């Protein structure tokens, strides 16, 4: 049951999550200028909303 070293896999889990999160974040780099402008405006909305909330 243990011959595949389960604790080693449990400690390899953060690398799997890091690879999946990096692949998910790389979808924002689609290379479209209009999306970059849109993301800048979205971040402006988020920053201003956070400043008004706090």
Ligand X SMILES: CCCCCCCCCCCCCCCCCC(=O)OC[C@H](COP(=O)(O)OCCN)OC(=O)CCCCCCCCCCCCCCCCC
Residues of this chain that interact with other proteins (CB under 8 A) are 18-19, 21-23, 25-26, 28-52, 54
Show Cβ contacts of residue 39 under 8 Å, excluding neighbours closer than 6 positions.
28
Q: Which of 6, 19, 20, 32 binds ligand X (CB under 6 A)?
A: 19
Whether 39 contacts 28, CB under 8 Å: yes
Using the rule CB under 6 A, give the single segment among 7-15, 16-24, 29-37, 46-54 that binds ligand LFA. Answer: 29-37
Show Cβ contacts of residue 31 under 8 Å, excluding neighbours closer than 6 positions.
none
Quick one: 12 or 39, whose CB is closer to ligand X?
A: 12
């Amino acid at each position: 049951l243990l011959k595949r070293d389960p604790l080693n896999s449990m400690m390899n889990i953060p690398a799997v999550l890091s690879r999946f999160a990096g692949k998910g974040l790389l979808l924002s780099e689609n290379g479209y200028l209009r999306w970059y402008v849109a993301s800048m405006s979205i971040g402006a909305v988020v920053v201003l909303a956070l400043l008004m909330v706090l």
